[PDB]
Amino acid sequence: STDFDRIYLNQSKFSGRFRIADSGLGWKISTSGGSAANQARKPFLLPATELSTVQWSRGCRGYDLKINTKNQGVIQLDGFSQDDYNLIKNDFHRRFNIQVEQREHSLRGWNWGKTDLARNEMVFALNGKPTFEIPYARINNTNLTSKNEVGIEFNIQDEEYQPAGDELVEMRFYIPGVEELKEKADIGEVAGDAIVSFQDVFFTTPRGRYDIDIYKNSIRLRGKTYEYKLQHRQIQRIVSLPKADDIHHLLVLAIEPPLRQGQTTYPFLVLQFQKDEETEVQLNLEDEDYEENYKDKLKKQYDAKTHIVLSHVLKGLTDRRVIVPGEYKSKYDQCAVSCSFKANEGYLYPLDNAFFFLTKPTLYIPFSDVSMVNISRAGQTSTSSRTFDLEVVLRSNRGSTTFANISKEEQQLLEQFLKSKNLRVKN
Amino acid sequence: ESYVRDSQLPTNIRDLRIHVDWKSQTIILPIYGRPVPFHINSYKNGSKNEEGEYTYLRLNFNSPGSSGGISKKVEELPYEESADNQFVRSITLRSKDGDRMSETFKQIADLKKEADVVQQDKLIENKTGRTKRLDQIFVRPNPDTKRVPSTVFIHENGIRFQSPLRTDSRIDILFSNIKNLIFQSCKGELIVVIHIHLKNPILMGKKKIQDVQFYREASDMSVD
């Protein structure tokens, strides 16, 4: 046998370890060391009875074994040099007796091909030249349209900045009008469930009027057009804000990663509610279990504002602090200031640690990330009517945003806020 | 074609950053740990989005619904070889984890752009007794931005515009390619002019031209 610690696997993952055996192949992920005392590893054994074919050659990336087996797993092995052909083949010629050809599955790179849905993978042959077979273990979600247009949404679990490497979101594809065929075998995996539901609630991103319900560890959004799933781990922050006129309330859910239809991005789920939406709700849970499920935060039956109820339930699920609207009063006792953006008028709301600009696109400007701000002004009689401009820079993203249409009183109140917060005002 | 054999490897064997090749007019991408090349002529466009800290790159190929406005139409690369066959339409990526992605995205932005004439029969020149020649004639469109004076001659199977008065370059026009010869005089006009309209446009000077004209000026305004 032989030992190497620089052998890679799952290229969107960090290196692993091998320890070759006569009986089989033993793969160990690189050990995780906590406090230099806790040593964590997951060993896997692939005995010789599972090997089916070997197509290792120099035409592909990362010159090293590319093994397919009958255990429904493909070991797309990486992390060996050019001189290991003789070594590995000398080791393998004892029993398996299989010649590794110079494939090089396909390199022509022309779009045309044929797709066949295999037992666990999707083989893509450009006239007998395979191009891709992704196993079904790595898929996350699948969406299909009326053109039999296929979009495969993935969700890779990042660990740290350095070892993440390359990592794919989407593999999309069109299929012509295949007769009496559809995408049968692709959808043969897990969405993974067992509290409360709502009816006829008004959402903005995507814009519409649908309903939302909560399972044990996620929420499902349903409508007559689409259905969406949102996991609690992806939810980051919950915000509640009023309108200028107080008549409407806004619930903004900051989530990461965004929920996409393949090609649209919805960073912040903005939900509009009315001031008269004061009703009672019922919790579909046992009178002894709901203590442990909600950590005693909420009662089984309670009547209050529906916005407050939904926000409190969301905070209870997330186990994080809430954001309260600021007590800083704008012009005419108002809580925000309106101005134009991307040819669209929207509001600015100050807060403890960030500015929130609504509503298309909902933009967060945290004060810590804020590098500096500047003011630009002209000299004219019309200056009193929504003229002054404020340009902020964020250094972390190198993002400069200019905020047009500010009047004298609004500029003065903003500047008063700005000195009181002790932010660097360039001039 | 992208490559043809194993001997020509990519620029680096361990391609842990998405690689863009320029010599072979193709680029490789790994779709989850195993390669594929695709072509610039097989590409349409790319786009970007940055959100919080996460980033989403979209790359769109040339395919039905993407290259062409209406499906089932007739296009050179995808449809002509096979009209009812599988192709790919667009993909996405998220490479927030390394500050090498904007560089390759701008290399995409210029690689998409980085990359044309029907050849007539050669016009036989013959200096016969019946020879047509007149001077101070100017051709339009001109070979270069400056204005070219020269002479014009008629032959038995085309029209020849001899440059040797200026630069000795040779431009040939095929009789069958000429569709309409028309004269227009100076009666109320500032020029006196011969237009030949062609069915098969020709490449000349710096560009591709269909309409060809030869005239003499009749200007009278002076600023002396």
XYZ file of C-alpha atoms in Angstrom:
651
model
C 0.000 0.000 0.000
C 0.915 3.689 0.035
C -0.191 6.884 1.780
C -0.712 10.424 0.471
C -2.386 13.392 2.173
C -2.690 15.652 -0.916
C -5.392 13.675 -2.773
C -8.480 15.694 -3.715
C -12.150 14.751 -4.107
C -15.383 16.687 -4.627
C -13.639 19.677 -6.216
C -16.024 22.001 -4.348
C -14.478 20.605 -1.149
C -11.076 20.376 0.510
C -8.546 17.573 0.105
C -8.906 13.981 1.314
C -6.854 10.885 2.179
C -6.458 7.428 0.628
C -5.114 4.151 2.004
C -5.111 1.524 -0.738
C -5.991 -2.071 0.154
C -5.996 -5.385 -1.671
C -9.641 -5.910 -0.702
C -10.805 -2.458 -1.771
C -10.369 1.306 -1.770
C -10.615 3.145 1.546
C -11.274 6.891 1.324
C -10.978 9.157 4.362
C -11.844 12.855 4.239
C -9.118 15.063 5.684
C -9.507 14.941 9.442
C -11.165 17.853 11.236
C -9.301 18.901 14.374
C -11.138 20.648 17.196
C -8.980 21.966 20.054
C -6.208 19.590 18.854
C -8.007 16.844 20.835
C -11.213 16.069 18.911
C -10.407 14.252 15.653
C -13.334 13.810 13.245
C -13.350 11.722 10.065
C -15.778 9.764 7.871
C -14.165 6.637 6.345
C -15.775 4.916 3.358
C -14.952 1.490 1.912
C -15.355 0.534 -1.768
C -14.543 -3.189 -2.118
C -13.264 -4.680 -5.358
C -16.631 -6.277 -6.211
C -18.115 -2.865 -7.146
C -15.582 -1.682 -9.751
C -17.134 -1.573 -13.236
C -15.118 0.683 -15.567
C -12.083 2.982 -15.485
C -11.641 5.841 -17.979
C -8.686 7.735 -16.497
C -6.695 9.771 -19.026
C -4.966 13.127 -19.494
C -7.735 14.711 -21.594
C -9.727 15.734 -18.496
C -8.953 17.936 -15.498
C -6.833 16.867 -12.566
C -5.026 13.862 -14.007
C -6.115 10.990 -11.747
C -8.577 8.070 -11.514
C -12.189 8.481 -12.706
C -14.033 5.457 -11.287
C -17.633 4.352 -11.866
C -19.101 1.639 -9.628
C -22.268 -0.372 -9.013
C -22.742 1.260 -5.581
C -24.439 4.178 -7.446
C -21.518 6.479 -6.533
C -18.931 7.858 -8.964
C -15.458 8.504 -7.528
C -14.272 11.364 -9.746
C -10.897 11.123 -8.134
C -8.325 13.922 -8.280
C -4.906 14.712 -6.841
C -2.222 12.593 -8.524
C 0.704 13.328 -10.819
C 1.609 12.160 -14.322
C 3.998 9.421 -13.147
C 1.330 7.515 -11.175
C 0.021 5.656 -14.252
C 2.597 2.887 -13.857
C 2.143 2.761 -10.068
C -1.665 2.547 -10.008
C -1.812 0.176 -12.977
C 0.837 -2.088 -11.431
C -1.259 -2.152 -8.264
C -4.518 -2.784 -10.166
C -3.326 -5.383 -12.703
C -3.271 -8.150 -10.068
C -7.025 -8.893 -9.935
C -9.253 -6.415 -11.757
C -7.543 -6.873 -15.154
C -9.091 -3.845 -16.868
C -7.366 -1.665 -19.460
C -7.719 2.099 -19.039
C -8.098 3.744 -22.440
C -7.141 7.284 -23.463
C -10.686 8.697 -23.013
C -11.083 11.781 -22.912
C -14.872 11.405 -22.829
C -15.504 14.414 -25.065
C -13.799 17.683 -25.954
C -15.443 18.827 -29.209
C -17.419 21.281 -27.088
C -20.169 21.725 -29.657
C -23.611 22.123 -28.147
C -25.402 19.321 -30.016
C -25.707 16.027 -28.165
C -28.098 13.404 -26.830
C -29.195 13.207 -23.185
C -30.162 9.863 -21.635
C -31.504 9.642 -18.075
C -29.404 6.902 -16.493
C -30.167 4.946 -13.324
C -28.488 7.619 -11.153
C -26.960 10.111 -13.635
C -27.662 12.006 -16.873
C -25.305 10.954 -19.675
C -24.664 13.532 -22.423
C -23.206 11.942 -25.579
C -22.138 14.084 -28.553
C -22.729 11.338 -31.128
C -21.319 8.574 -28.951
C -18.897 10.841 -27.029
C -20.047 11.327 -23.392
C -19.769 14.851 -21.978
C -21.356 14.842 -18.526
C -22.895 12.475 -16.000
C -23.739 14.179 -12.692
C -24.953 11.748 -9.983
C -28.312 12.398 -8.341
C -26.704 12.823 -4.903
C -25.543 16.365 -5.691
C -28.833 17.672 -7.128
C -31.014 19.816 -4.848
C -34.155 21.030 -6.691
C -35.697 20.819 -10.167
C -38.083 23.168 -12.000
C -39.799 22.630 -15.350
C -41.800 24.897 -17.693
C -44.277 24.568 -20.573
C -41.510 24.419 -23.218
C -40.171 21.381 -21.311
C -37.441 23.804 -20.237
C -35.458 22.315 -17.359
C -33.701 24.206 -14.572
C -31.755 22.401 -11.857
C -31.209 24.584 -8.782
C -28.399 23.483 -6.467
C -27.557 24.481 -2.896
C -23.913 23.840 -1.976
C -22.989 23.968 1.719
C -20.128 26.440 2.048
C -17.623 25.860 4.862
C -14.955 28.603 4.658
C -13.532 31.171 2.250
C -10.451 29.271 1.074
C -11.473 25.611 0.507
C -14.803 26.420 -1.185
C -13.306 26.741 -4.661
C -15.512 26.416 -7.717
C -19.176 25.747 -7.019
C -22.214 25.777 -9.302
C -25.770 27.034 -8.740
C -27.685 26.203 -11.891
C -27.625 23.762 -14.789
C -30.317 24.775 -17.282
C -31.283 23.212 -20.542
C -34.071 23.189 -23.125
C -35.604 20.071 -24.674
C -37.611 20.199 -27.966
C -41.161 18.935 -28.341
C -40.391 15.335 -27.428
C -43.495 13.254 -28.126
C -44.942 11.272 -25.197
C -41.755 11.760 -23.180
C -41.038 14.016 -20.226
C -38.410 14.439 -17.485
C -39.381 11.344 -15.531
C -36.272 9.933 -13.851
C -34.630 13.243 -12.878
C -37.259 13.968 -10.208
C -36.671 10.877 -8.076
C -35.046 12.320 -4.949
C -35.987 14.249 -1.801
C -38.446 18.169 -0.984
C -38.108 17.273 2.691
C -42.996 17.723 6.436
C -45.219 18.299 9.470
C -48.365 24.292 12.816
C -49.972 27.408 11.323
C -51.157 28.739 7.961
C -52.383 32.014 6.469
C -54.858 32.865 3.706
C -54.809 35.618 1.066
C -51.729 37.594 2.109
C -50.160 40.211 -0.159
C -46.497 39.768 -1.165
C -44.233 41.955 -3.307
C -41.180 39.842 -4.303
C -42.441 38.011 -6.355
C -45.371 40.388 -6.511
C -48.757 38.799 -5.936
C -51.473 37.588 -3.578
C -50.929 34.043 -2.258
C -50.734 32.104 1.039
C -47.966 30.921 3.376
C -47.745 28.074 5.908
C -45.135 26.842 8.400
C -43.870 23.271 8.801
C -41.614 21.929 11.566
C -38.387 23.434 10.170
C -39.300 25.498 7.079
C -42.068 27.533 5.443
C -43.896 26.782 2.192
C -45.338 29.587 0.076
C -48.174 28.446 -2.196
C -50.085 30.295 -4.889
C -52.154 29.507 -7.945
C -49.086 30.032 -10.188
C -45.984 28.872 -8.253
C -44.918 27.152 -5.038
C -41.778 28.160 -3.138
C -39.849 26.705 -0.192
C -37.858 28.723 2.349
C -35.697 27.119 5.032
C -35.187 28.609 8.487
C -31.393 28.321 8.262
C -31.341 30.615 5.218
C -33.355 33.319 7.008
C -30.985 35.955 8.408
C -32.956 38.916 9.790
C -36.526 40.147 10.308
C -37.464 43.839 10.037
C -40.770 45.616 10.690
C -41.343 49.210 9.566
C -44.323 51.590 9.195
C -45.398 53.746 6.252
C -45.143 57.522 6.076
C -48.927 57.745 6.532
C -48.974 54.884 9.151
C -51.736 53.186 7.087
C -49.444 50.340 5.902
C -46.799 48.184 7.589
C -43.837 46.488 5.905
C -42.257 43.191 6.988
C -38.853 42.702 5.339
C -37.193 39.282 5.615
C -33.464 39.376 4.873
C -32.452 35.905 3.666
C -29.347 34.380 2.165
C -29.129 32.671 -0.366
C -31.912 34.291 -2.424
C -34.865 32.338 -3.745
C -34.732 32.457 -7.542
C -36.834 31.259 -10.461
C -33.535 30.481 -12.207
C -32.829 34.032 -13.321
C -34.464 36.537 -10.904
C -33.054 37.546 -7.513
C -35.119 38.357 -4.402
C -32.720 39.359 -1.592
C -35.312 40.835 0.759
C -38.864 39.493 1.025
C -41.051 42.593 1.447
C -44.594 42.007 2.713
C -47.298 44.686 2.983
C -49.970 44.657 5.704
C -52.895 46.904 6.609
C -53.463 48.665 9.923
C -56.938 47.114 10.324
C -55.568 43.544 9.986
C -56.304 42.753 13.642
C -57.487 39.145 13.988
C -56.867 36.035 16.092
C -54.880 32.954 15.069
C -54.719 29.346 16.255
C -51.616 27.199 16.748
C -51.950 23.593 15.539
C -49.930 22.074 18.367
C -50.530 20.247 21.627
C -50.988 22.226 24.841
C -47.882 20.572 26.348
C -45.698 20.299 23.226
C -45.915 23.948 22.162
C -43.862 24.902 25.242
C -40.876 22.970 23.911
C -41.529 23.839 20.271
C -41.729 27.636 20.767
C -39.445 27.796 23.856
C -42.370 29.267 25.844
C -42.174 32.454 23.747
C -45.747 32.281 22.385
C -49.133 31.132 23.670
C -51.369 28.529 22.034
C -54.188 31.061 21.484
C -53.590 34.805 21.263
C -55.288 37.810 19.648
C -53.272 40.839 18.513
C -52.165 42.649 15.365
C -51.490 40.158 12.583
C -48.228 41.910 11.672
C -47.028 41.739 15.278
C -48.070 38.076 15.457
C -46.198 37.121 12.289
C -43.094 39.083 13.287
C -43.064 37.553 16.776
C -43.467 34.030 15.373
C -40.635 34.708 12.921
C -38.362 35.960 15.707
C -39.244 32.924 17.817
C -38.324 30.588 14.967
C -35.082 32.406 14.112
C -33.858 32.850 17.730
C -32.409 36.300 16.994
C -32.921 39.916 18.009
C -35.537 42.130 16.358
C -35.161 45.594 14.816
C -37.439 48.321 16.200
C -38.199 51.424 14.071
C -36.277 54.499 15.114
C -37.799 57.350 17.096
C -36.271 59.965 14.760
C -39.021 62.099 13.224
C -38.643 63.404 9.670
C -40.441 66.331 8.026
C -44.067 66.756 9.174
C -43.625 64.040 11.852
C -42.976 61.519 9.030
C -40.778 58.448 9.552
C -39.013 58.401 6.147
C -37.966 60.563 3.186
C -38.931 60.010 -0.464
C -36.548 60.332 -3.420
C -36.006 59.015 -6.947
C -33.905 55.985 -7.895
C -33.353 54.001 -11.098
C -36.236 56.121 -12.415
C -38.359 55.061 -9.395
C -39.483 56.938 -6.278
C -38.918 55.225 -2.932
C -38.423 55.929 0.753
C -35.391 56.077 3.036
C -35.739 54.846 6.631
C -32.894 55.484 9.108
C -32.278 52.947 11.858
C -29.812 52.104 14.627
C -27.175 50.441 12.417
C -28.225 50.940 8.779
C -30.211 52.937 6.256
C -32.990 50.995 4.520
C -33.943 52.275 1.063
C -37.252 50.934 -0.264
C -38.762 49.345 -2.282
C -37.214 48.535 -5.690
C -34.399 47.361 -5.078
C -34.508 47.136 -1.282
C -31.048 48.387 -0.297
C -29.269 48.149 3.058
C -26.487 50.610 3.874
C -24.915 49.589 7.217
C -23.185 52.391 9.084
C -20.102 50.290 9.844
C -19.564 49.577 6.142
C -20.329 53.216 5.237
C -17.002 54.841 4.369
C -18.086 58.453 3.853
C -20.865 60.720 2.619
C -20.845 63.949 0.611
C -23.379 66.641 -0.291
C -23.832 68.385 -3.646
C -25.909 71.533 -4.097
C -26.556 74.211 -6.722
C -27.344 77.907 -6.339
C -30.824 78.872 -7.536
C -34.231 79.975 -6.295
C -35.523 76.433 -6.921
C -33.066 74.966 -4.380
C -35.800 74.974 -1.719
C -37.809 72.341 -3.671
C -36.262 68.858 -3.537
C -32.837 69.646 -5.043
C -29.954 68.774 -2.697
C -28.109 65.476 -3.262
C -26.283 63.065 -0.928
C -23.627 60.624 -2.176
C -22.570 57.706 0.055
C -19.716 55.259 -0.557
C -19.401 51.683 0.722
C -15.774 50.539 0.652
C -16.368 46.808 1.185
C -18.107 46.539 -2.211
C -16.663 49.734 -3.779
C -20.263 50.849 -4.235
C -21.107 54.538 -4.673
C -24.777 55.567 -4.539
C -26.043 59.126 -5.071
C -29.330 60.130 -3.451
C -31.017 62.901 -5.419
C -33.979 65.171 -4.666
C -33.525 66.489 -1.093
C -34.932 69.821 0.140
C -33.565 72.237 2.756
C -35.465 70.870 5.769
C -34.806 67.244 4.821
C -31.105 67.970 4.312
C -30.921 69.752 7.674
C -32.635 66.904 9.533
C -30.424 64.313 7.830
C -27.308 66.318 8.707
C -28.466 66.637 12.327
C -28.900 62.858 12.444
C -25.474 62.515 10.853
C -23.611 64.599 13.443
C -25.530 62.911 16.265
C -24.408 59.535 14.893
C -20.849 60.866 14.400
C -20.397 59.797 10.769
C -17.667 61.248 8.568
C -19.248 63.953 6.388
C -16.916 64.954 3.562
C -17.027 68.487 2.180
C -13.648 22.600 -32.715
C -12.024 23.406 -29.376
C -9.145 20.890 -29.212
C -8.299 17.710 -31.120
C -5.939 15.589 -28.968
C -4.705 14.973 -25.435
C -1.280 16.510 -26.116
C -2.722 20.047 -26.086
C -3.591 20.496 -22.412
C -5.178 23.581 -20.834
C -2.951 26.352 -19.532
C -2.866 24.700 -16.083
C -3.558 21.082 -15.165
C -5.194 21.987 -11.819
C -7.768 24.485 -13.067
C -9.156 25.495 -9.666
C -10.127 28.875 -11.169
C -12.489 29.033 -14.138
C -10.231 29.261 -17.170
C -10.710 31.243 -20.375
C -8.661 30.228 -23.430
C -7.901 32.688 -26.241
C -5.756 30.761 -28.742
C -8.314 27.998 -29.418
C -11.371 30.359 -29.339
C -13.060 28.366 -26.576
C -13.229 28.366 -22.781
C -13.474 25.491 -20.296
C -15.816 25.271 -17.339
C -16.092 22.545 -14.673
C -19.727 21.551 -14.090
C -19.071 20.108 -10.630
C -15.564 18.697 -10.821
C -15.176 17.538 -14.428
C -14.494 19.584 -17.551
C -16.184 20.834 -20.674
C -15.126 23.324 -23.386
C -17.551 25.578 -25.231
C -17.164 28.051 -28.072
C -17.466 31.790 -28.593
C -19.644 31.182 -31.649
C -21.597 28.879 -29.317
C -21.994 31.821 -26.880
C -24.482 34.683 -26.646
C -23.739 36.867 -23.622
C -22.907 37.065 -19.916
C -24.251 38.985 -16.937
C -23.462 39.655 -13.278
C -25.196 40.220 -9.965
C -23.786 40.966 -6.506
C -26.028 40.605 -3.462
C -24.932 41.141 0.129
C -21.707 39.146 -0.029
C -22.904 36.437 -2.455
C -22.383 36.726 -6.217
C -24.239 35.171 -9.165
C -22.750 35.035 -12.677
C -24.984 34.053 -15.610
C -23.556 32.855 -18.945
C -25.897 32.343 -21.912
C -25.053 30.255 -24.967
C -26.312 30.525 -28.551
C -29.317 28.203 -28.757
C -33.050 28.186 -29.589
C -34.917 30.868 -27.674
C -31.538 32.504 -26.918
C -29.704 33.181 -30.187
C -32.908 33.409 -32.257
C -36.025 35.380 -31.420
C -38.396 32.617 -32.574
C -37.791 28.892 -32.195
C -37.738 26.353 -35.046
C -36.174 28.959 -37.379
C -33.099 28.552 -39.641
C -29.667 29.511 -38.270
C -26.167 28.585 -39.376
C -24.513 26.863 -36.437
C -27.221 25.184 -34.278
C -30.079 24.473 -36.687
C -28.374 23.800 -40.030
C -26.491 20.677 -38.918
C -29.424 19.467 -36.789
C -32.760 21.244 -36.313
C -34.458 18.859 -33.828
C -31.558 18.084 -31.460
C -30.618 18.800 -27.828
C -28.568 21.934 -27.067
C -27.864 23.925 -23.881
C -29.153 27.460 -23.323
C -27.598 29.076 -20.236
C -25.783 28.331 -16.958
C -24.854 30.130 -13.729
C -22.048 30.177 -11.152
C -21.210 31.715 -7.752
C -17.509 32.417 -7.145
C -17.629 34.803 -4.178
C -14.980 32.697 -2.418
C -12.101 34.085 -4.512
C -11.219 37.546 -5.837
C -10.324 36.249 -9.297
C -13.806 36.213 -10.851
C -14.291 39.793 -12.092
C -11.040 39.439 -14.044
C -12.275 36.395 -15.951
C -15.695 38.030 -16.374
C -14.145 41.010 -18.165
C -12.000 38.610 -20.204
C -15.345 37.053 -21.129
C -16.654 40.530 -21.971
C -13.944 40.999 -24.616
C -13.568 37.338 -25.711
C -17.225 37.183 -26.806
C -16.422 39.921 -29.314
C -12.970 38.837 -30.499
C -13.228 36.544 -33.524
C -16.633 37.678 -45.629
C -17.118 38.232 -49.365
C -18.446 36.563 -52.498
C -15.569 36.408 -54.978
C -16.387 37.498 -58.524
C -14.787 36.160 -61.685
C -11.623 38.007 -62.674
C -12.331 40.745 -65.225
C -10.138 40.221 -68.292
C -8.355 43.429 -69.311
C -7.857 43.994 -73.043
C -6.388 47.105 -74.692
C -8.296 47.040 -77.974
C -8.694 49.792 -80.554
C -12.048 50.765 -79.036
C -10.828 51.987 -75.637
C -12.837 54.207 -73.293
C -10.855 56.698 -71.209
C -11.786 59.933 -69.448
C -9.973 61.781 -66.658
C -10.696 63.825 -63.519
C -13.071 60.955 -62.639
C -13.666 60.253 -58.935
C -15.016 56.940 -57.609
C -17.379 56.701 -54.635
C -17.284 54.930 -52.147
C -13.562 55.644 -52.141
C -10.844 53.149 -51.123
C -9.745 55.479 -48.299
C -11.203 58.569 -46.602
C -9.319 60.851 -48.996
C -10.711 61.516 -52.463
C -9.270 59.433 -55.307
C -8.906 60.867 -58.847
C -8.388 58.387 -61.668
C -9.658 57.118 -65.043
C -12.321 54.571 -66.010
C -12.383 52.050 -68.880
C -14.914 49.649 -70.418
C -14.031 46.064 -71.344
C -16.017 43.190 -72.826
C -17.047 41.415 -69.587
C -16.944 44.006 -66.809
C -15.955 47.473 -65.631
C -12.368 48.307 -64.637
C -11.314 51.280 -62.488
C -7.543 51.729 -62.873
C -5.869 53.501 -59.923
C -2.223 53.877 -61.354
C -2.713 57.640 -61.552
C -2.829 57.455 -57.724
C -1.599 54.084 -56.318
C -1.578 51.274 -58.997
C -4.167 49.227 -57.037
C -6.646 47.252 -59.150
C -10.423 47.106 -58.614
C -12.549 44.847 -60.832
C -16.317 44.746 -61.433
C -18.152 41.919 -63.207
C -20.650 42.670 -65.991
C -23.081 40.020 -64.740
C -22.782 41.500 -61.246
C -23.763 44.955 -62.520
C -27.562 45.206 -62.349
C -28.298 48.772 -63.539
C -26.174 51.385 -65.326
C -27.688 54.885 -65.244
C -26.419 58.319 -66.286
C -27.283 61.578 -64.542
C -26.148 64.892 -66.001
C -25.559 68.393 -64.584
C -29.023 69.716 -65.509
C -29.795 71.406 -62.202
C -27.227 69.119 -60.532
C -23.882 69.903 -58.909
C -22.156 66.808 -60.394
C -22.108 64.767 -63.608
C -22.290 61.128 -62.752
C -22.420 57.464 -63.800
C -23.979 54.990 -61.353
C -23.629 51.219 -61.589
C -25.817 49.250 -59.172
C -24.632 45.721 -58.428
C -26.425 42.575 -57.272
C -23.316 40.935 -55.755
C -21.502 43.546 -53.608
C -17.706 43.581 -53.698
C -15.012 44.069 -51.069
C -12.733 46.981 -51.952
C -10.425 49.416 -50.212
C -11.376 49.141 -46.551
C -14.956 47.847 -46.682
C -17.781 45.977 -48.406
C -19.763 48.042 -50.939
C -22.784 47.354 -53.166
C -23.301 50.728 -54.860
C -20.489 52.027 -57.088
C -20.399 55.427 -58.790
C -17.997 57.547 -60.846
C -18.490 61.300 -61.239
C -16.970 64.689 -61.968
C -17.747 67.804 -59.942
C -19.405 71.003 -61.182
C -18.805 73.249 -58.173
C -18.861 77.023 -58.677
C -18.632 78.488 -55.160
C -15.203 79.911 -54.309
C -13.639 81.235 -51.103
C -10.463 82.631 -52.680
